[PDB]
Structures are given as structure tokens and as C-alpha cells.
Amino acid sequence: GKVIKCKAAIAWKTGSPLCIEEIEVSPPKACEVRIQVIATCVCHTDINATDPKKKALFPVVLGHECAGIVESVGPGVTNFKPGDKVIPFFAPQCKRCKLCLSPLTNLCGKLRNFKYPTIDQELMEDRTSRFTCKGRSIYHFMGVSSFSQYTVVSEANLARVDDEANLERVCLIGCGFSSGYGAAINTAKVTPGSTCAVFGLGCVGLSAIIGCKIAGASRIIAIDINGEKFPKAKALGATDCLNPRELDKPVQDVITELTAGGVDYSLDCAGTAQTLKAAVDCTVLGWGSCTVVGAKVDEMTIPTVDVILGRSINGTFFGGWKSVDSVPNLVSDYKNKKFDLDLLVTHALPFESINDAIDLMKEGKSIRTILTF
Amino acid sequence: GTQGKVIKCKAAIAWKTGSPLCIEEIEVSPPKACEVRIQVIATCVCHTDINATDPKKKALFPVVLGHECAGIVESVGPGVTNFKPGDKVIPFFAPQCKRCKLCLSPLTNLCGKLRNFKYPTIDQELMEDRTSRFTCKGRSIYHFMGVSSFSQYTVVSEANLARVDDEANLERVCLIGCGFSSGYGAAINTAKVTPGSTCAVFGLGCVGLSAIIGCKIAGASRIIAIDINGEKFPKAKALGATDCLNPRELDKPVQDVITELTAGGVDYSLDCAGTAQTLKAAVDCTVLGWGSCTVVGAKVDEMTIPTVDVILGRSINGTFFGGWKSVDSVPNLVSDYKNKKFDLDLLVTHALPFESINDAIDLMKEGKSIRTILTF
Ligand SMILES: NC(=O)c1ccc[n+]([C@@H]2O[C@H](COP(=O)([O-])OP(=O)(O)OC[C@H]3O[C@@H](n4cnc5c(N)ncnc54)[C@H](O)[C@@H]3O)[C@@H](O)[C@H]2O)c1
Ligand SMILES: NC(=O)c1ccc[n+]([C@@H]2O[C@H](COP(=O)([O-])OP(=O)(O)OC[C@H]3O[C@@H](n4cnc5c(N)ncnc54)[C@H](O)[C@@H]3O)[C@@H](O)[C@H]2O)c1
Ligand SMILES: [Zn+2]
Ligand SMILES: [Zn+2]
Numbered sequence: 219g220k221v222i223k224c225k226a227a228i229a230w231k232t233g234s235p236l237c238i239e240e241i242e243v244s245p246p247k248a249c250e251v252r253i254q255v256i257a258t259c260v261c262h263t264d265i266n267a268t269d270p271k272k273k274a275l276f277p278v279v280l281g282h283e284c285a286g287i288v289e290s291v292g293p294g295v296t297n298f299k300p301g302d303k304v305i306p307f308f309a310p311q312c313k314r315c316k317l318c319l320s321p322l323t324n325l326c327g328k329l330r331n332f333k334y335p336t337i338d339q340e341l342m343e344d345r346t347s348r349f350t351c352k353g354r355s356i357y358h359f360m361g362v363s364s365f366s367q368y369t370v371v372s373e374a375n376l377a378r379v380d381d382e383a384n385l386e387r388v389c390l391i392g393c394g395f396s397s398g399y400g401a402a403i404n405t406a407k408v409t410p411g412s413t414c415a416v417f418g419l420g421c422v423g424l425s426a427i428i429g430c431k432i433a434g435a436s437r438i439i440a441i442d443i444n445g446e447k448f449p450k451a452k453a454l455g456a457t458d459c460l461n462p463r464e465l466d467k468p469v470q471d472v473i474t475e476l477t478a479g480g481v482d483y484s485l486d487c488a489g490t491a492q493t494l495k496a497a498v499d500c501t502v503l504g505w506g507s508c509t510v511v512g513a514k515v516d517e518m519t520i521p522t523v524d525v526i527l528g529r530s531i532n533g534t535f536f537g538g539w540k541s542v543d544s545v546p547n548l549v550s551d552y553k554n555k556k557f558d559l560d561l562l563v564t565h566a567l568p569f570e571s572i573n574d575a576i577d578l579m580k581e582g583k584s585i586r587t588i589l590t591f
Numbered sequence: 592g593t594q595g596k597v598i599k600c601k602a603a604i605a606w607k608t609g610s611p612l613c614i615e616e617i618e619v620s621p622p623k624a625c626e627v628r629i630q631v632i633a634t635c636v637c638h639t640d641i642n643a644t645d646p647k648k649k650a651l652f653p654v655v656l657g658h659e660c661a662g663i664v665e666s667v668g669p670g671v672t673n674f675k676p677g678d679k680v681i682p683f684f685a686p687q688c689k690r691c692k693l694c695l696s697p698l699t700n701l702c703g704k705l706r707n708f709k710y711p712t713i714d715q716e717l718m719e720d721r722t723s724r725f726t727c728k729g730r731s732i733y734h735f736m737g738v739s740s741f742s743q744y745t746v747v748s749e750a751n752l753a754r755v756d757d758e759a760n761l762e763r764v765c766l767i768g769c770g771f772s773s774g775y776g777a778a779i780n781t782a783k784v785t786p787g788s789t790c791a792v793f794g795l796g797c798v799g800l801s802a803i804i805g806c807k808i809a810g811a812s813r814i815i816a817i818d819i820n821g822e823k824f825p826k827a828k829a830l831g832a833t834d835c836l837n838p839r840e841l842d843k844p845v846q847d848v849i850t851e852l853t854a855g856g857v858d859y860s861l862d863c864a865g866t867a868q869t870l871k872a873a874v875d876c877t878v879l880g881w882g883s884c885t886v887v888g889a890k891v892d893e894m895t896i897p898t899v900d901v902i903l904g905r906s907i908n909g910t911f912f913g914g915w916k917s918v919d920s921v922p923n924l925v926s927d928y929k930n931k932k933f934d935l936d937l938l939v940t941h942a943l944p945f946e947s948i949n950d951a952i953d954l955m956k957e958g959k960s961i962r963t964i965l966t967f
């Protein structure tokens with residue numbers, strides 16, 4: 219149980235980017251595992267914390283998508299040992315609450331702020347922190363904090379995985395891939411031979427397409443305002459591609475015409491007012507289904523008639539997966555080549571170059587950027 | 592009443608919005624191909640009808656309103672064999688052609704007969720050949736929702752009616768024409784209330800109460816009834832409500848009352864009022880993870896749903912005629928009523944002569960009635 223000194227990325231406040239600092243990562247207490255981050259990625263959620271218009275706590279060690287090894291475990295911990303390949307996640311499964319036992323949801327009672335899940339799991343189970351830098355205790359982020367060479371997480375926020383897993387790719391299963399993928403399969407519940415529509419072709423949206431294909435969809439329409447996204451969209455299974463920017467008609471009307479009624483399943487992995495409205499509009503009447511995955515705005519307005527006429531609306535949380543039991547399976551699949559994560563990794567960079575990773579992200583020049591140490 | 596001949600009878604015409612209904616003598620043309628002329632025996636005023644007289648609402652005039660009724664076939668048109676003079680029938684706004692994609696899908700109860708998907712209320716304003724069967728004072732009167740039951744005799748499409756048990760009490764079974772079927776089906780079909788679950792219903796009118804009946808039948812273990820009219824609580828409870836709430840007498844939003852009361856929220860919520868308040872509340876009051884909200888009523892065009900709610904498990908949908916496959920379901924509902932599966936009798940508060948329709952409308956407006964049977 220020795221204290222560890224390593225580099226991590228600290229956000230001391232909004233507006234101000236992340237700083238590479240030297241922090242002290244305390245050892246894991248009971249029911250906790252101290253992880254060694256091998257590969258982490260910057261996700262849209264990470265960058266929001268620094269946005270003033272968005273709620274967040276500081277100072278904080280951001281990041282939540284990664285994969286690694288077990289550095290050391292805490293007391294009573296027997297499910298983990300030094301060397302085990304593990305993947306942490308923001309979606310807990312403590313297996314000690316009513317929600318964990320329910321087959322109707324993948325939510326867990328460990329959670330507490332159901333209005334701002336982004337500022338939850340800001341501290342360990344004992345309301346304490348394991349991060350210290352220059353005499354100050356730093357907040358954890360969404361129960362993961364992957365932007366540090368070493369981090370400590372609740373046994374409820376990680377799963378051991380295949381020993382032969384390539385941490386440089388399997389890490390996406392920590393958030394990006396799992397949400398898009400699971401959103402199509404568990405939340406939207408895409409059915410064989412169906413027609414789907416996916417707005418937003420980032421990591422989530424692409425995994426949603428991968429998800430639609432795996433579920434057996436016969437048609438998959440990918441929509442983005444960034445044409446540069448299309449090539450890879452098709453690579454993963456898209457049958458059609460639309461750019462609102464190049465259409466003299468609201469993209470939803472185009473989709474409705476191209477399908478003679480609209481699509482059976484809609485998945486919004488963008489989250490804008492425009493996309494949210496379209497995601498619903500483009501669905502057929504009677505059984506049309508829209509599933510919210512991404513959300514850049516807090517509210518969505520829905521016509522009372524649309525709903526009276528068959529269209530339903532739901533949303534996903536971590537792809538609807540029961541984290542601790544599913545993550546390991548998703549890994550086995552990638553291994554068995556059920557799908558290919560590599561197409562999702564467009565860049566790789568030294569951890570210290572995390573800000574440039576953020577810049578490529580914002581610039582929309584990438585899907586996911588693997589950060590190594 | 593003789594076939595192939597125009598009929599002179601009385602109806603209730605709405606010459607324009609903001610105006611009451613006028614008892615006029617109209618001419619009801621005989622049925623054309625795939626049509627049936629019905630002698631309306633019993634009819635009721637639904638909120639949807641009154642809604643048409645609202646100046647702020649998009650509607651067409653002149654028109655014979657009414658869509659909730661029951662009656663006897665006075666005659667059929669060319670090439671009609673499923674119906675014949677004497678048959679008891681119940682028409683409805685929800686068509687079932689049986690010969691279209693939508694009709695074949697077990698996922699919806701809509702048929703491709705419907706044309707206007709943004710303003711249903713002003714759809715089926717005329718017959719298939721784009722004309723009218725109604726003439727009054729040298730003028731063409733608009734039909735309403737493919738029924739127009741506010742006339743002793745009316746002409747409807749074969750896809751808009753079902754033949755029911757010859758021994759059906761048409762002065763009760765007429766509620767299956769809309770009100771009952773809607774709330775009842777909403778809980779059973781659209782919301783899909785399951786055994787042991789907890790439900791919340793907003794709006795304790797005919798629909799709202801039928802929604803309660805349906806929750807009881809589906810096996811709910813708790814049915815919370817919400818309404819700003821405490822007078823509606825006795826019947827609501829009589830039909831199955833285990834708890835009753837009035838937002839006008841609470842310090843906290845009703846949805847927070849319901850959340851606490853249920854330690855998390857209800858499994859299924861049905862909004863049979865349809866206001867900006869009820870809609871928001873209907874979604875809020877549900878449990879996260881698997882909470883389900885079903886829109887039944889709607890006095891407003893839109894509802895604002897928080898992104899996080901949906902992400903965190905709550906989902907939304909709505910019903911159209913309770914989600915019953917019209918022609919196939921309606922006769923079944925009648926049999927169920929005969930087998931005393933439920934009591935429509937409790938949904939009837941008044942019974943006036945057709946001439947008093949304007950009073951029946953006021954009673955509804957003034958929330959002093961559930962349903963008022965109108966007879967000719
Ligand atoms: N519900 C969950 O559990 C969950 C899990 C992970 C990520 N997310 C969220 O999902 C979203 C997507 O994640 P990402 O990593 O792919 O982000 P990203 O920024 O890379 O993806 C957004 C994509 O949508 C496109 N876009 C923007 N406006 C558009 C418009 N009007 N029409 C069409 N396309 C448009 C962009 O060009 C881009 O390709 C984020 O908002 C993220 O926070 C949600
Ligand atoms: N979706 C469909 O297919 C369908 C079919 C038929 C009728 N409807 C609609 O369903 C609704 C109900 O029909 P009805 O015949 O029972 O109408 P109604 O006028 O008799 O019922 C209104 C009821 O809601 C209550 N109410 C009003 N504001 C409220 C509030 N803020 N909170 C709680 N309760 C409130 C009233 O006090 C009253 O008891 C109407 O809007 C009607 O047009 C929909
Ligand atoms: Zn993420
Ligand atoms: Zn749990």
C-alpha cells in the first residue's frame with residue numbers, strides 16, 4: 219500500500235485547459251483497485267467540464283475511457299490481482315443495490331445526482347479522494363479519472379478482461395464504442411431487416427452503426443455535417459450517407475422520401491436541437507422509434523401528435539449495458555472479431571500531448587485518439 | 592329511411608368556431624360504393640368535438656361534429672356485403688382497411704386510410720370520392736373524423752365501423768365508439784400496464800377513468816388518480832384508484848408527491864388531461880430506468896422533455912384510439928361488456944334528448960359530467 223508518484227492531467231478551473239502535473243496517488247483502500255493506465259482517450263464529456271456554461275467541480279482529474287492493468291488491489295479484494303487486464307467505466311454495477319438486481323435497467327444505486335451525472339462519483343466510496351497534488355486534494359471524475367498514469371476506482375467501476383486483450387484498442391469499450399454499440403442493441407433494440415438512421419458520426423455514432431449491422435438491419439443511413447466522416451461510416455456498415463449541409467431540404471424530409479415513410483429506428487449521437495428534432499421526424503409513424511444517445515442541449519421538444527401517431531422516444535445510458543458483466547463479453551467479441559475497434563482509432567499521441575488530442579477532437583479531425591504513456 | 596333516397600332528418604351543425612350548435616334539418620345522401628348509412632341511436636359529446644369549436648384551434652366549417660356513437664344500418668352502398676339493414680354497429684375515427692402495411696403491422700393500429708398526420712382532427716372531412724353526404728340549406732356540410740354522429744342518419748366508410756352483437760345496449764355500448772376504448776386501450780395496449788406495477792393517471796374524465804379500468808384489468812397493484820377536480824375522485828376510486836391527488840391542494844408539484852409516495856415513482860403513467868402541466872408531470876412522476884409515460888390526452892401541441900431523463904431510462908409514447916385494431920377489436924369490447932368484464936354504466940352521468948346537445952356540451956365544459964347520452 220505505497221503512495222505513488224506519477225503524472226496526470228489536472229483541470230484547476232473552467233476555461234483553463236488541462237495541466238500535466240506530478241501528483242500523489244494514494245493506495246487503494248477496501249473494495250477498490252489501483253489501476254495502471256496504458257491507453258486512455260479524450261471523450262466529448264471530458265472536454266465539457268472545462269466549458270464555463272457547463273456544471274463541474276475543480277480541481278479534477280478528468281478522463282473516463284481507458285484500459286489497463288491491476289497495479290494493486292485493496293483489502294478483502296480477491297476478484298483482482300496485480301497484472302489483471304481491466305477496463306474501468308462511469309456506469310457502475312455495485313451488485314449491492316435494487317437497481318443492479320433489476321433486469322429493467324442498467325443503472326445502479328451507487329449513483330446519486332440524476333440531473334447532473336457529470337459531477338457525480340466525484341469522490342470515492344468513503345467520500346474521500348486518492349489524488350493529491352501540491353498539498354491539495356483533487357476531485358475524481360465520473361468515478362474513473364483515466365488521465366493519470368495511475369488511478370484508483372471503486373470495484374464497482376471496472377471489470378477484469380481477457381488476458382490477451384490489446385489495451386490500445388479495447389480501451390474504447392470503456393465508453394465510446396460501448397455506448398453507441400449498446401444503444402443500438404439494448405436501447406433502440408434494432409431488429410433484423412429494419413431501417414436505421416444515425417445522426418452524428420463520431421465514435422458513438424459509428425459504434426451505433428456497427429451496432430445496427432450486428433443487430434441485422436438491412437439499411438443504415440448515416441447523417442453528419444462533416445462529409446469527412448462518411449468513408450469510415452460506410453466501412454463500418456452504412457448503406458447511405460447524408461449531409462444536411464448539401465441538402466436543400468431538412469435532412470429529415472430527405473430521409474422520409476428516400477424511405478417512403480421514414481425509418482424504423484432513429485439514434486441521435488450528435489445531441490443538438492436540430493438533430494434531436496430530426497431524429498424524431500425521420501421515423502415512420504405507427505412504430506417509429508427514436509433513441510437519444512448524445513445530448514449537447516438539456517431539453518428536447520416533442521410534438522404531441524407525433525407521439526399519438528406511433529412514434530416513441532427513449533434514451534440510453536452507457537449503451538444500456540450492465541457494465542461489470544458486459545464489458546468482459548464485449549472484449550471477447552472484439553477478440554473473436556465480431557467487430558473491429560481499430561477503425562475507430564484515428565490517432566495516437568504521448569500523454570503529454572493531451573491538449574493536441576483535445577484540439578483534433580474539437581477540430582472534428584478525429585474519431586478517437588489513443589493516449590499512451 | 593328508404594334506400595337509394597336522400598333522407599331528411601335533423602342534425603347539429605357547427606356553422607363556425609366560437610359558435611354553439613344549431614339544430615337544422617339536413618339531407619343525408621344515400622351511401623356510395625363501400626359506404627354505409629347508419630341510423631344513429633345513441634351519441635355522446637367527447638372533448639375532441641368541443642375542441643373543434645375552439646377559435647384558436649385549426650378546424651373546418653360548416654360541419655356535423657360527433658364521433659362517439661352506436662346505431663343501426665339503414666342501408667349500404669354498391670358492392671357492400673359485410674353489412675346489411677338491421678345490423679348493430681359502432682363507427683369510429685380510427686380506420687382499419689386491413690389491406691395495407693400499417694394494418695398488417697402488429698405494432699400499430701393506424702391504417703393507410705389516414706392522410707393528414709399533423710392535423711388529424713381536420714382529416715376525413717369528406718368521403719373517399721372527395722365529396723359530402725351532408726346538405727343543409729343548399730350547402731355542403733363537412734364530415735368530422737369520418738363519423739359525424741350528430742345527425743340521426745350518417746354515412747361512413749366500411750373501414751370505419753364494426754358490426755357488433757345484435758343484443759348490444761346501443762345506449763351504453765356507444766361509449767366504445769371512442770371514450771372508453773381510448774383510455775381502456777391506452778393502459779392495456781399502448782402503456783402496456785403489467786401485473787403488480789404502479790400507475791398514475793392524469794385527467795379523470797371518461798378516458799382517464801377508462802384508463803383506470805384498464806390498469807385494474809392489466810393487474811396494476813396501485814393506481815394513482817390525479818385531477819384538479821376533486822369531484823372526480825369518488826368514481827375514480829370506484830373504478831380502481833387506490834390513491835387520489837389534487838394538484839390545487841398541494842404545496843409541492845404533484846410529480847414530487849407521487850415520486851415520494853412511491854419511493855422513486857410510478858412504473859407507468861398515462862396523461863388523459865393533456866396540459867403543459869400534466870405532460871411534464873406525467874413524465875417526471877415515473878421511475879427512472881424503466882419508467883414509461885403514455886400520452887393519451889393533449890390540449891397542447893408540444894411537450895418539453897429533459898434530455899437527461901430519457902438518457903436515464905424514462906421513455907415516452909402515445910396512443911391513438913387506445914391502440915385497438917378498430918374493426919377487429921370493437922366487437923370484442925362489446926362482448927366483454929356483455930360478459931360484465933367492465934361497467935360503462937358508471938361512465939354515464941346524464942342522458943338528454945339530442946336537442947339538448949348544447950347543454951351536454953356545457954356540462955362537459957363545466958366538468959359536471961363524464962358522459963351524456965344523447966338520443967333522437
Ligand atoms: N448516453 C451515454 O451514455 C453517452 C455515452 C458516451 C458519449 N455520449 C455523448 O454522445 C455524443 C457523441 O459522442 P462522440 O464521441 O462521437 O462525439 P463527437 O463530437 O466526435 O461526435 C459528434 C458528431 O456529430 C456531428 N454533428 C454535429 N452537429 C450535427 C448536425 N447538425 N447534423 C449531423 N451531424 C452533426 C459531428 O460532425 C460529429 O461527427 C456526445 O455528445 C457525448 O457526450 C453519451
Ligand atoms: N389519443 C386518442 O386517441 C384520444 C381519443 C379520445 C379522446 N382523447 C383526448 O383525451 C382527453 C380526455 O378525454 P375526456 O373525454 O375524458 O375529456 P374531459 O374534458 O372530460 O376530461 C378532462 C379531465 O382532465 C382534468 N384536468 C384538466 N386539467 C388538469 C390538470 N392540470 N391536472 C389534472 N387534471 C386536469 C379535468 O378536471 C377533467 O376531469 C382529451 O384531451 C381528449 O380529446 C384522445
Ligand atoms: Zn465518454
Ligand atoms: Zn448497484
Ligand SMILES: [Zn+2]
Nearest residue numbers: 637639769770
Ligand atoms: Zn373522442
Ligand SMILES: [Zn+2]
Nearest residue numbers: 688689694702
Ligand atoms: Zn389499413
